[PDB]
Amino acid sequence: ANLYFQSNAVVVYGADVICASCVNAPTSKDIYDWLQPLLKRKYPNISFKYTYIDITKDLTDHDLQFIERIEQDELFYPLITMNDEYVADGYIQTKQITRFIDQKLVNE
Numbered sequence: 001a002n003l004y005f006q007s008n009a010v011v012v013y014g015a016d017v018i019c020a021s022c023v024n025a026p027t028s029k030d031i032y033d034w035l036q037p038l039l040k041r042k043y044p045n046i047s048f049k050y051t052y053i054d055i056t057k058d059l060t061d062h063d064l065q066f067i068e069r070i071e072q073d074e075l076f077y078p079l080i081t082m083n084d085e086y087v088a089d090g091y092i093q094t095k096q097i098t099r100f101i102d103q104k105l106v107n108e
Contacts, residue, residue: 001083001108002108003046003101003104003105003108004045004046006047007047007048007049008046008047008048008049008082008083009048009049009051009082009083009084010035010039010048010049010050010051010080010081010082011050011051011052011053011063011080011081011082011084012028012031012032012035012050012051012052012053012078012079012080013028013053013055013063013066013067013070013077013078013079013081014027014028014029014031014032014052014053014054014055014077014078014079015028015054015055015056015077016028016029016054016056019076019077019078019090021073021076021090022076022090022091025090025091025092026078026092027078028052028054028077028078029052031078031080031092032050032052032078035050035080035097036048036050038094038097039097039101042098043101046101048082053067055067055070055071055077060084062081062084066079066081066086070089075089075090076089076090076091077089077090078090078092080092080097082100082101087100088100
């Protein structure tokens with residue numbers, strides 16, 4: 001797999017309400033709105049497609065797979081995944097997002 005061969009699926013699993021385990025952290029929608037410009041700016045030549053999944057509203061085996069871990073308190077939300085791979089959940093740092101992509105650019 002290579003980040004440049006296709007538009008990359010970036011998903012944010014969350015809800016319109018805050019996650020108990022990270023009360024002070026940025027909301028799911030904030031992160032979703034923040035993530036879009038961030039990547040468009042740092043990785044101009046990569047194409048990303050964004051999707052927001054409210055674990056309430058109610059899906060792929062993966063969507064359901066991550067939503068399950070959140071519902072069982074294993075993972076927190078906002079939860080970010082790129083191409084169905086776990087990237088970050090709950091408290092999220094910019095470096096986590098960049099290092100995950102950079103690592104791919106450098107190795108794959």
